Amino acid sequence: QPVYPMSQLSFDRILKKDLVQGEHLGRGTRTHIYSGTLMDKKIKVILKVLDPSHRDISLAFFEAASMMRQVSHKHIVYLYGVCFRDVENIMVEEFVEGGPLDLFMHRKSDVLTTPWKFKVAKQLASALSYLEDKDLVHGNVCTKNLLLAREGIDCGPFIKLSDPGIPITVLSRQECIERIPWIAPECVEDSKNLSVAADKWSFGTTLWEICYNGEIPLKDKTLIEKERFYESRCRPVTPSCKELADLMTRCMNYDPNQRPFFRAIMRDINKLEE
Hints:
- This protein has helices at 5-9, 55-70, 101-107, 114-133, 173-178, 185-189, 198-211, 223-231, 242-251, 262-273; strands at residues 19-28, 31-39, 42-50, 79-83, 90-94, 146-150, 158-161.
- It has 274 residues and is α+β, with helices and mostly antiparallel strands.
- The protein folds into two domains: 1-95, Phosphorylase Kinase, domain 1; 96-274, Transferase(Phosphotransferase), domain 1 (Orthogonal Bundle).
- α4 packs antiparallel against α7 (198-211), α4 packs antiparallel against α10 (262-273) and α7 packs antiparallel against α9.
- It is globular and about 50 Å long.
């Protein structure tokens, strides 16, 4: 177990002068994502830049970074360090060539296969099992946050789970509602309810995305409608794939305590593979 991890992160300090900002690639919750270069020979990197924020937000952003720095798993993105600047705080991560899984699945939906989809699920379960072992919570598990290291269409796919961004702990109620149906319902009720169990629900919604080739669940639904969705205790529509649908259902239990451990999920996944 890490000893003063945030304090350690202060030493991983990356200076702005060693960075080159590349193209804008995407957006997250109060963040912007860029490709970039890290100098000493150079490394291609991803830069996650936090919008100018209050100190409590910056601090939480840094805690997410610290978490990523401490973990070491083949299916979780490596974090090089952070750039500390009051008005421009930056996570510096390895560049994963294949990009976000949601975009990939959209363009390649016609050639995706059953074992391809199952392998992605299994790899994510492996990463979340590791986090569960360490009593760590991610809180932003979704296909947009899964990156393809190996495409595996033509030796299957290889995914890497990206960072959580700003922890749910300090997000506004509106930002939590916006994350429906990925966010665990207890976190919508109160962000203080965040726990390891939250990632089980998210994994369920992530499986839904995989079954539906990166389709956004509840796309075009207003925040009011999303809030009503959990109020009425609904789930996204059952996917045709029984194996993944069954996992999704077990994970999307409104009682956090009843969501199966990832160790159990991994056992179940390996049983199916026999």
